[PDB]
Design a binder for this molecule. Structure first.
Ligand code: MG
Ligand code: MG
Ligand code: MG
Ligand code: MG
Ligand code: MG
Ligand code: MG
Ligand code: MG
Ligand code: MG
Ligand code: MG
Ligand code: MG
Ligand code: MG
Ligand code: MG
Ligand code: MG
Ligand code: MG
Ligand code: MG
Ligand code: MG
Ligand code: MG
Ligand code: MG
Ligand code: MG
Ligand code: MG
Ligand code: MG
Ligand code: MG
Ligand code: MG
Ligand code: MG
Ligand code: MG
Ligand code: MG
Ligand code: ZN
Ligand code: ZN
Lengths: 97, 97, 127, 91, 25, 214, 202
RNA sequence: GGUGAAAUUCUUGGAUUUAUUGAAGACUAACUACUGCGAAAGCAUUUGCCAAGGACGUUUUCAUUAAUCAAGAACGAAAGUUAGGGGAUCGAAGAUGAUCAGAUACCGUCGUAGUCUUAACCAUAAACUAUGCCGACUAGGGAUCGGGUGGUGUUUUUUUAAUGACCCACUCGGCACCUUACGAGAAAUCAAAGUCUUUGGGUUCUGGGGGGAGUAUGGUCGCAAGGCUGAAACUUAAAGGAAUU
């Protein structure tokens, strides 16, 4: 699954959670993929999406609220966006995503 | 005392089967216990067959019958239809004829 | 060769219904039924009754123009006996025997994917 | 330390009005004080005040809803019906 | 008398002695 | 002292193109009296004629067809397609005990945007050396056959304007494509489409209706 | 105040002058602050929008519907109510709806409604429990509470007044043709008594 | 129209019928069987999603972790109860038409609750195989469901395979039937109800003549109806089972 690979990336690669840091990660060209929660307000989605393409970073719209994405990254708090800084032995960077 | 190893009809390993409504009196009766007969009989009868292909287009053309099942409610199945009674050891025999 | 029509015999018990309509249905002709040719209220379906009403039936059937007709025999159906009444086998006979023609008849007894609990309670009509 | 065996919030009414009236109230009363999940921001901070009006502690969004609960059953079916008929008029 | 009708019999009979005894609780 | 027989007008029914004969029969309506005349109020009817009478041979004894009547001109009311059924007896005669039944169906459109739902029935068959008396399938056979039947049926429809689907059904093309893909799963004697109903049709388009006429 | 349902303040632009123009809607359950509302013939079919009953498929559920086009909304305004579109007659462009009372009216297809139900539903399920709750209720509507029964008044006061026990004295079903000072009781009552059987008009 | 036969009823309101079409709720017909599955209740239209399971295959793993169980607990047909929805059907109640000496019924008409569903209760059925669970052993037969193994078996042709279904032998584990019976029983019957006066594998539960009576009383659970627990005084020579005539 898409969770299945996120769960790998969590356990073998590098990442960062939250909005301020993915932008620090977008500005430094570090993010290879950002994952946006369904209920994240559009304006933030827009701004991330804009910051994305300026970085030529790909964007996956996680079909799901922030409460769920926090679960998917294996965290007990809610997360609105994620930034894959290095994918581990997972292939999200180079699969149908 | 008991007077049938089947207690009635055809149910071992199940526990409950849906009932059917008798075709004569409409009494409910479990389908496993409900004396059944397929009704196959022509539309035309012993005499109307000759009168049929006489004043008819399409030489004899099909003679198609009507087919339906019947469900009896032992009370009814005994009143008219196929049991009437069997003796003690006549009871056992399940040969149709 | 001839001029077609639909018969659609509904021969339940306690009455029998023979009436011809256009091969399309929306236009009907010549209905008179089995409770119309006797007055006994227990002979309202007997073959001897549906016969006499088959005679009046084919009469207008030719007095209007149908020389041939297909039949669609039918019982009560629905949640009922599903089985043909007695005055159907008389009627089909006494309408082909009236010099009418017969082609490709079938059965149109309504038969459901069982539902709509029958009348008369789980213990049956006990008499 | 379990304080009441069945009255719960409804204990404020003491003995008055009759058990079956207080049961009916207690239900809608529990319905109508409770903290609900914000469909918009995620956190569970939709509270009520003025039946019909439900607003979120932070993100301060206000949703019209049921008199003592956020989504009334009917409204929710009406949603899916409106969904149903809308998609009927895109394809 | 049918066993079950004797069940209903004493069911009522209890509900009446149940009732009558309450005049005095 | 009325006898509307002295009053009603007559009419003769003509079938569409893709059959053998087009001359069907007669009908009674009314005098074309202004303010509810014999045209607009009716003739939007159907007729149930067995296609073995609409084609001629008796390898078509089952398979009733409904002909809806859509346009009228000068004692001549051409008809179009409205549905197809089976004779009650045929079905009643295919369903025998000791064998598995299998039914499937799908709602689907066409280029000529006639939405419809076709059906499909099929019964198991005994291998012609088989000793065990009943020969049932495996309920995963059953689910697969429906998938393939549903695979095969969805392609025929939305294949161009049910008038061609008409030309597709009449020669039983579908029936074998079923059985061909099927033989890898289970024997399955007695495969037919067995039914199709019509539920939504597009705007009249007086032009395209006269495509099957002449 | 004195209303079952919440209102919805919805500002539009004045197409003809540079200014904002605030309208007061009845909040349809599910609408929310910051939402965009779309009002027009060629508008889409979401909860909140306002659309002419002709432009909606049957089965649609609309509130605050006008009885004549443009009267700015008469039917189905109380908390929890709505009307259901149940067919169109495109020529004459009527639309048949079923009001909350069950009665089925047929109004113009240009009559407008707002997609959904009115908010605050189910308010009447909760017992008032006591005089004061009723008091504050009517304190904000009209001086209609509490109600003395005509049967505990003296005859000067009511058709039902007087007698040495409390009793109505004559049939309490009064006729339409009655006159002021006579109509108290069950006016025009065509049946009376406990309603056995199921309600809900065919 | 309905019935043994009738009648209460429906019919200028075009009934009943016919035709085209629409809406509502319920059900899943034929296929359905000495067929499958689940702890039991119970489970039968398609498709997607969600977790679950037995049997089997096994030169995998752990290594006594298990058997059966007072207390306690999960589930628990139908009806019935609370609050919403639903309310097609059939239909306790009630009202009728008949029948009857009577007829509070059987039969016919109407038809309230109900019947379906959501949230909650209720915990009982001839809830039946009237037959506790685990283990061992004791005797023949042919069908069948699932799994597996064996194949110069049949059938599908394409060019032969592979496949799939089919056939034959065997082996696990199912639901059942047949025939015998060493054996068992008061018998009817019974591969367990056998391997008991030649009386002992482990374990749980219940009964001790018939009424009184599942009543009285207390305790407890329940909104209620009622569930569980449950006496006695007194009375009585039978009550009962299976088979024969
Ligand atoms: Mg006996
Ligand atoms: Mg049974
Ligand atoms: Mg049972
Ligand atoms: Mg009735
Ligand atoms: Mg009898
Ligand atoms: Mg007192
Ligand atoms: Mg006042
Ligand atoms: Mg007062
Ligand atoms: Mg008052
Ligand atoms: Mg006074
Ligand atoms: Mg007066
Ligand atoms: Mg006065
Ligand atoms: Mg007075
Ligand atoms: Mg008084
Ligand atoms: Mg089915
Ligand atoms: Mg204790
Ligand atoms: Mg009802
Ligand atoms: Mg009565
Ligand atoms: Mg009487
Ligand atoms: Mg009575
Ligand atoms: Mg018990
Ligand atoms: Mg039993
Ligand atoms: Mg046994
Ligand atoms: Mg093999
Ligand atoms: Mg054996
Ligand atoms: Mg108590
Ligand atoms: Zn019967
Ligand atoms: Zn919020």
């Amino acid at each position: 699954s898409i969770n299945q690979k996120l769960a790998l990336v969590i356990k073998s690669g590098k990442y960062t959670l939250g909005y301020k840091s993915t932008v620090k990660s977008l500005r430094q060209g570090k993010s290879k993929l950002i994952i946006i929660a369904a209920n994240t307000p559009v304006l933030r989605k827009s701004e991330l999406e804009y910051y994305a393409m300026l970085s030529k970073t790909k964007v996956y719209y996680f079909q799901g609220g922030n409460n769920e994405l926090g679960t998917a990254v294996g965290k007990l708090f809610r997360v609105g966006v994620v930034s894959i800084l290095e994918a581990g032995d997972s292939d999200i960077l180079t699969t149908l995503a | 005392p008991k007077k049938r190893a089947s207690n009635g009809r055809n149910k071992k390993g199940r526990g409950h089967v849906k009932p059917v409504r008798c075709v004569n009196c409409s009494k409910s009766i479990p389908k496993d216990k409900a004396i059944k007969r397929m009704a196959i009989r022509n539309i035309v009868e012993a005499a109307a067959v000759r009168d049929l292909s006489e004043a008819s287009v399409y030489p004899e053309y099909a003679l198609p019958k009507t087919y339906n099942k019947l469900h009896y409610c032992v009370s009814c199945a005994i009143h008219a239809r196929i049991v009437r009674v069997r003796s003690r050891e006549d009871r056992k025999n399940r040969a149709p004829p | 060769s001839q001029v077609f029509g639909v018969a659609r015999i509904y021969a339940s018990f306690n009455d029998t219904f023979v009436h011809v309509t256009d091969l399309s249905g929306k236009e009907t002709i010549a209905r008179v039924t089995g409770g119309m040719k006797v007055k006994a209220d227990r002979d309202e379906s007997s073959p001897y009754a549906a016969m006499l009403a088959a005679q009046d039936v084919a009469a207008k059937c030719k007095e209007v123009g149908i020389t041939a007709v297909h039949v669609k025999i039918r019982a009560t159906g629905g949640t009922r006996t599903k089985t043909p009444g007695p005055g159907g086998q008389a009627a089909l006979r006494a309408l082909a025997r009236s010099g009418l023609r017969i082609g490709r008849i079938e059965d149109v007894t309504p038969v459901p994917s069982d539902s709509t609990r029958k009348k008369g309670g789980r213990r049956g009509r006990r008499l | 330390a379990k304080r009441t065996k069945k009255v719960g919030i409804t204990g404020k009414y003491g003995v008055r009005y009759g058990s079956s009236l207080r049961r009916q109230v207690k239900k809608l009363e529990i319905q109508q004080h409770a903290r609900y999940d914000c469909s918009f921001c995620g956190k569970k901070t939709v509270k009520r005040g003025a039946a019909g009006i439900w607003t979120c502690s932070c993100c301060k969004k206000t949703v019209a809803g049921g008199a003592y609960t956020v989504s009334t059953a009917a409204a929710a079916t009406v949603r899916s019906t409106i969904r149903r008929l809308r998609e009927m008029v895109e394809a | 008398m049918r066993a079950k009708w004797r069940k209903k019999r004493t069911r009522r009979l209890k509900r009446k002695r149940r009732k009558v005894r309450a005049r005095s609780k | 002292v009325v006898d509307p027989f002295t009053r009603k007008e007559w009419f003769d029914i003509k079938a569409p193109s893709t059959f053998e004969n087009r001359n069907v029969g007669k009908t009674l309506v009314n005098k074309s009296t202004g303010l509810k005349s014999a045209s607009d109020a009716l003739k939007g009817r159907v007729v149930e004629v067995c296609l073995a009478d609409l084609q001629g041979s008796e390898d078509h004894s089952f398979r009733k067809i409904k002909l809806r009547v859509d346009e009228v001109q000068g004692k001549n009311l051409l008809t179009n397609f409205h549905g197809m059924d089976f004779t009650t007896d045929k079905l009643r005669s295919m369903v025998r005990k000791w064998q598995t039944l299998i039914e499937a169906n799908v709602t689907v459109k066409t280029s000529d945007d006639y939405v419809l739902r076709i059906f499909a029935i099929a019964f198991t068959r005994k291998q012609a050396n088989q000793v065990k008396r009943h020969s049932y399938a495996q309920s995963s056979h059953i689910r697969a056959i429906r998938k393939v039947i549903s695979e095969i049926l969805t392609k025929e429809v939305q294949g161009s304007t049910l008038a061609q689907l008409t030309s597709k059904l009449i020669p039983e093309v579908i029936n074998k494509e079923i059985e061909n893909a099927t033989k890898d799963i289970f024997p399955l004697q007695n495969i037919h489409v067995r039914k199709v109903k019509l539920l939504k049709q597009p705007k009249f388009d007086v032009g395209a209706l006269m495509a099957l006429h002449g | 105040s004195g209303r079952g349902a919440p209102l919805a303040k919805v500002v539009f632009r004045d197409p003809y002058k540079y200014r904002l123009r605030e309208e007061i809607f009845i909040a349809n359950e599910g609408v929310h602050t910051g939402q965009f509302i779309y009002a027009g013939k060629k508008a889409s079919l979401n909860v909140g929008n306002v659309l002419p009953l002709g432009s909606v498929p049957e089965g649609t559920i609309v509130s605050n519907v006008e009885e004549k086009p443009g009267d700015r909304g008469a039917l189905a305004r109380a908390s929890g109510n709505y009307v259901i579109i149940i067919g169109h007659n495109p020529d004459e462009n009527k639309t048949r709806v079923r009001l909350p009372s069950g009665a089925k009216k047929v109004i113009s297809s240009d009559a407008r409604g707002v997609i959904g139900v009115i908010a605050g539903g189910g308010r009447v399920d909760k017992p008032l429990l006591k005089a004061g709750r009723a008091f504050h209720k009517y304190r904000l509507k009209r001086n209609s509470w509490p109600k003395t029964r005509g049967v505990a008044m003296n005859p000067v006061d009511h058709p039902h007044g007087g007698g040495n026990h409390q009793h109505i004295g004559k049939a309490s079903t009064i006729s339409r043709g009655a006159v002021s000072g006579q109509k108290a009781g069950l006016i025009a009552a065509r049946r009376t008594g406990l309603l056995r059987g199921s309600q809900k008009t065919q």
